[PDB]
Design a protein around this ligand. Structure first.
Ligand SMILES: [Mg+2]
Ligand SMILES: [Mg+2]
Length: 429
């Protein structure tokens, strides 16, 4: 179950093809290791600008999470923490809780959805009950479901960045989601539309029943949210998504959490994770045009938050490019002359069985269908997240090295950095 770690003093951002051409795995190490009774889970990674990297994670305080692996459960403290690097991930600060350490159910937050374009980081989190399944019917629970958000103001992203977070505030769903709908978030990097200001908010819905009469009928609603220091929920995008009963336990839907992979200002396209209880082991693809148009893909998948990065003309793969030029014009940096166009590409990583092996893949940027090759990035995992640095190298945060002696799902949090040529050599023909 243990990984072979690489810890290097890179130069920070790379600045020339000669420096980078022979490098493959530039870093691959646990930024968070043993943590006693605390569980660090569901990480998301952000390249802030320059050599600055942000990792956001939930922290379940002295307990493993709900029985269905949700951070909040309407009674235990759960924080959302952040780590910062100013040397392209060579070194990360010790994790700090956004807004101070959680102390009760009333300030607990988990499953962060993280949005960023350039000066402000927006984190929208599950709060109160989340989509946790407990002993009570949802209608009887007192902390019911809630959404909360914090805004991180970024300073110095072109030197060595600092962030300060606003107070957690409630993001009301009144008039958007009815009572009864138990709802929450599913961890990941959030989509910002082409205008740079409209965020896509995916609200996960779930009929969970209770212990002794469990259900898991899941769905989603997508909403516009305008980037702002005060957030409010805007217009609905398309239809309410509801997944159908699977072939397993009665009341368990074939797919669980839907996560946006694209938004064209008209419809949200989503990948949905297959239910290990009644699904087909493959990621599902659908969009907000209908209540349920999801179709099976050929991508193997399971529970958890997949990583997904779309590059627009900025993938050079095995071909030479100028990493200094990449910082100012990522789509025009290729060739020995340093000014050729790259191509579109999608990078995707997810586990193939529950808490199993994490495979990275290239997907076609129009239909998101996989190429034939896949690269194992972890023996044991569940959630991961991908981004690209201003020098063109690929960064990943992922749960790895499951502690099988621990009560729930306990992992270490890994940071990894790869050259595009290495990834190409493993994923392309
Ligand atoms: Mg070092
Ligand atoms: Mg304050």
């Amino acid at each position: 179950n243990q990984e072979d770690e690489i810890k290097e003093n890179t130069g920070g951002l790379q600045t020339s093809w000669d420096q980078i051409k022979d490098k493959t795995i530039m870093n691959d190490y646990a930024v968070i290791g043993e943590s006693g009774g605390d569980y660090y889970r569901n990480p998301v990674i952000v390249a802030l600008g320059g050599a600055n990297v942000l990792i956001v994670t939930e922290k379940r305080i002295n307990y493993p999470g709900s029985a269905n692996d949700i951070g909040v459960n309407g009674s235990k403290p759960v924080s959302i923490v952040y780590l910062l690097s100013s040397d392209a991930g060579d070194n990360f600060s010790s994790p700090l809780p956004i807004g101070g350490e959680s102390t009760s159910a009333d300030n607990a937050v988990s499953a962060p959805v993280v949005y960023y374009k350039k000066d402000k980081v927006y984190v929208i989190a599950s709060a109160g009950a989340g989509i946790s399944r407990t002993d009570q019917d949802y209608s009887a629970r007192n902390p019911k479901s809630m959404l909360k958000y914090s805004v991180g103001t970024v300073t110095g992203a072109d030197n060595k960045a600092s962030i300060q977070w606003s107070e957690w505030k409630e993001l009301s769903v009144s008039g958007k989601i009815g009572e009864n709908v138990q709802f929450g978030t599913h961890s990941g990097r959030g989509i910002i539309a082409s205008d740079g200001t409209t965020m896509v908010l995916p609200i996960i819905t779930a009929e969970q029943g209770k212990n002794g009469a469990a259900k898991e009928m899941m769905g989603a609603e997508f909403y516009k949210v305008t980037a702002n220091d005060t957030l409010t929920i805007g217009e609905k995008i398309g239809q309410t998504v509801k997944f159908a009963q699977g072939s397993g336990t009665s009341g368990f839907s074939k797919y669980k959490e839907a996560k946006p992979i694209a938004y064209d200002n008209t419809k949200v396209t989503y990948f949905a994770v297959p239910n290990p209880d009644g699904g087909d082991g493959k990621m599902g693809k659908g969009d907000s045009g209908a209540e349920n148009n999801v179709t099976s893909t050929t991508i193997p998948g399971s529970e958890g938050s997949f990583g997904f990065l779309k590059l627009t003309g900025s993938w050079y793969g095995a071909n030479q490019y100028d990493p200094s030029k990449y910082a100012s014009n990522p789509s025009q940096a290729g060739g020995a002359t340093g000014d050729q166009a790259g191509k579109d590409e999608v990078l995707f990583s997810h586990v193939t069985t529950p808490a199993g092996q994490n495979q990275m893949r290239l997907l076609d940027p129009q239909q998101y269908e996989p190429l034939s090759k896949s690269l194992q990035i972890s023996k044991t995992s569940k959630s991961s997240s991908i981004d690209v640095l201003p020098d063109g190298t690929i960064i990943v945060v992922a749960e790895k090295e499951r502690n099988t002696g621990a009560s729930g799902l306990k992992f270490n949090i890994f940071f990894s950095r790869y050259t595009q040529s290495y990834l190409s050599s493993q994923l392309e023909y």
